[PDB]
Design a protein around this ligand. Sequence first.
Ligand code: CA
Length: 1001
Amino acid sequence: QIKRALELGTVMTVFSFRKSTPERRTVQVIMETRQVAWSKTADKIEGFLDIMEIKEIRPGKNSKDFERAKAVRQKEDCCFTILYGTQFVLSTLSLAADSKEDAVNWLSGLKILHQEAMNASTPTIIESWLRKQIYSVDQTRRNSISLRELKTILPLINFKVSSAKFLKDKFVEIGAHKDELSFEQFHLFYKKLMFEQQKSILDEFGSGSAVYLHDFQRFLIHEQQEHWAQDLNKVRERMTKFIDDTMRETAEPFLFVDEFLTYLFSRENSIWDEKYDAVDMQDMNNPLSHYWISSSHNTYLTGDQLRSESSPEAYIRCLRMGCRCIELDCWDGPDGKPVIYHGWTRTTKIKFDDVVQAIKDHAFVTSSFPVILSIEEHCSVEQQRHMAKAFKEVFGDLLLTKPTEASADQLPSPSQLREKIIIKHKKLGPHKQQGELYMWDSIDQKWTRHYCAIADAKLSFSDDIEPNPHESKPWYYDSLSRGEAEDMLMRIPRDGAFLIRKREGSDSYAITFRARGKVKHCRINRDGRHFVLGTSAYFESLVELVSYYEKHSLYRKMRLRYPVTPELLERYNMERDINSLYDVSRMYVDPSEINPSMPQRTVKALYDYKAKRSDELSFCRGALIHNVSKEPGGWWKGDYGTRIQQYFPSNYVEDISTADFEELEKQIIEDNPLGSLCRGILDLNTYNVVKAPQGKNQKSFVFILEPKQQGDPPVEFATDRVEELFEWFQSIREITWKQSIAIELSDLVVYCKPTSKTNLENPDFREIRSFVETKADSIIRQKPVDLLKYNQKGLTRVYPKGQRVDSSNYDPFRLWLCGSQMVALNFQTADKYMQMNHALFSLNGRTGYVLQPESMRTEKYDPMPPESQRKILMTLTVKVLGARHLPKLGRSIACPFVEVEICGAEYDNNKFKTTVVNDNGLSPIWAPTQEKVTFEIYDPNLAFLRFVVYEEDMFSDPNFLAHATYPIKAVKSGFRSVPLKNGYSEDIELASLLVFCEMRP
Ligand SMILES: [Ca+2]
């Protein structure tokens, strides 16, 4: 059809906000990889996007590329935008065609090409994936593969080649006529690799020669509990649709046992129950107060709360996920039209008019159910009039302007309010000093950018905002012992301080670095010419290794920054003498003093214990040990005093009581404006501020906090402009020396009238109460039953505390179980709680409304029963058997393990982890190591089954790879695939666990 017109290609004009001049390119669809490619010449493809990653094809000149370009002369009807990607912020390919003909050809042709890809079988996606891989080396659109190029690819696809024999022994077995492998020679290699690596799973299945039509139907009926599989003709179809072999399609289909394993790891065999993919309108006729409503906080932001980009695309992205409650922070614009950003911060400003349009175009595309606009009002009465007018005019009939029923005593249903936009805004009755400053490092002799803020006469500042050639380099030490290195690096008080030394009595090396006032050592061996850090981190050169870990994290979030040289030790030693009269530590804060006390992860010592090893902690009876990570057997890991996560006997501690609570409440860290991002705090009452007449260290604009108190260190800050320095100077000097609503908008508030009324008695259904995270958590703590009863008729919004400046999220489980409707979360953040939110709102067809269960509305509903009165409705047993295509995080091959947990407000860290597989992300296996674990579930409708895949790095630290999180409601039994998602809950190509699950009611 037009698919051939797209496969051939089309010359069009590409626009990037990243490139300043539009570039003419041939745009084509490679059917073999299912990519949209754009090339300058025929030989090489400049750039590509996977069709699988397309979220929207938007006609016109509505993209960041278009609006940032100089002109765009091409017509609206020749212009369109492919919005694609794996993150919250989607990439944009903005295109202008020569003609309206071609443009319309693409929008139609791409839509059907996407659907084909979505609906395609796993074996079709594998061939596309194998096609992508051989293209990737030299980008020629290759036909065959070298032996040396396959050995270069295997580590990139997260597999370590055990030996050279393994490939050649394979090569022969597949048929290695030469070192070259054709595409189908490579295709056959993958299948053999996957089967041989994972064969052992079969010991759980039949002793037949292959899996025949009848064997498979039994498997679907009895072990998978699929009762459609009675209809034997449906079972033969599934087989054939999977296989796709014309010669075997004849008569009765059978899978080869390796094709059966592939099916078990495949989408087709997902743990997810599909009936929950559609809306159920029988669950959409309850009052609005009975629904969990997918809710965003400060929707405009794409990043942190301090300096990240505001975009209308954030509203679009959230709305098209089915988010139904979005936030507009409305501030006085320059031209009497409101702007939206985070007040007083360096977050970019966007126009209210662009957000209103964006909401109108996107509110009701993927979900028909009512959208709630939470308006935080800082605008003038006149600017409020523009908002009242703009809403009415742009939204028209979509804008709820009067109640659904006049004589109502409860809220209307989501059904009744379809394609309605509801204004939450204060209804009429009938200036923090902050920004970016440069700070000076005497060690590095460099300035870095920090976000700083003054709260209650205290300036808080953030962390910074971003042939053996090593023999000449002064960070390399030819003849240095392990003990000296530790002492040398213990002299330099900086995380990321490093040197590389040759190991004593060996032609091999080590990197030793300081992290959190403690030195660590990393072994660097040689593989012929190459250098290997730990196990599989390959480098050509120790300079290349140092370059990489300057840009990429080596240990946790520590990078290499401070090369420990003789010149640095010489300089710092003298400077430490000169600066002896003050203690520099006092301006920085301790990394534990910003880390909160864990809700329930604290133990109390039953006995005195003396450490038999440096590994082990030593403590007295009565000692409270915090942030305990519980593993099986004798030894647990936890923090006591200064030390962190050291080993101790588990049978030497007991649970804390309420009597210990008061002691932990005193130990609760004092919040600062930068929360987790805070690096140091300065008491401006104990300083004078002076401007350096001629700046300092090559900055012109430098102010200095000079200490009043003995021992307190002076602090130097710099600005880009003298005007910044003045505002900071006068803000600091003023410490060191020492409600109108526009009727027009007010009238648009039908429901969701904000109220205060002190406390939760007499809920009005037209009213909404909002609680910051902190207030919400104290209500849950003291008044949970009041919140529940209020939430039956009234609505509740919760939003993150102001300190979550990193755009981190908070536990919504307890709030949800008290019937709280709008638990507003940072959708731009890839963390556990957004993952929970996406899981919950995957139910009921991604409408962003989930009916609270009937159980929550009976008199005998208790979220928190006593231990002895715990009623068990279901047991869930889980075995993690294996995984395919785990992502490669960094430079080394994944050493994966899986953590399984039942998530909810009834569950105190109810998890188990698998053992670690060494250097294999492509095809790990865990089946032989552990038995099933059994979970007791109190209510299946109130809980989530969460799988998280971690890599175990060289330091034994867990790093996130993927997750899958499901309401237990939608979990199927038997040998099930678990399709793995990234931190943003976007699908990772061909990535899946294989698990066994048993649910007994
Ligand atoms: Ca806000």
